[PDB]
């Protein structure tokens, strides 16, 4: 478990490791925006 003083951000932390994946997804929203140029 995290140290007590950070107890707070426990559920943010369950989510953090997945953020890198989002950058790949985000690359495709960008190309949808620009018309797969």
């Amino acid at each position: 478990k995290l140290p007590e003083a950070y107890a707070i951000f426990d559920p943010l932390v369950d989510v953090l490791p997945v953020i890198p994946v989002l950058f790949l997804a985000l690359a495709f929203v960008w190309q949808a925006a620009v018309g797969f140029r």
Binding site: F9, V15, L22, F23, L26, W30, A33, V34
Partner: peptide
Amino acid sequence: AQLTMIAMIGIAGPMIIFLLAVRRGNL
């Protein structure tokens, strides 16, 4: 309590694109 901080993260990405388009930036 896993929307009090997540949902904001997943929206961050597409919100950047919705702001650069609608303000035409170098996309």
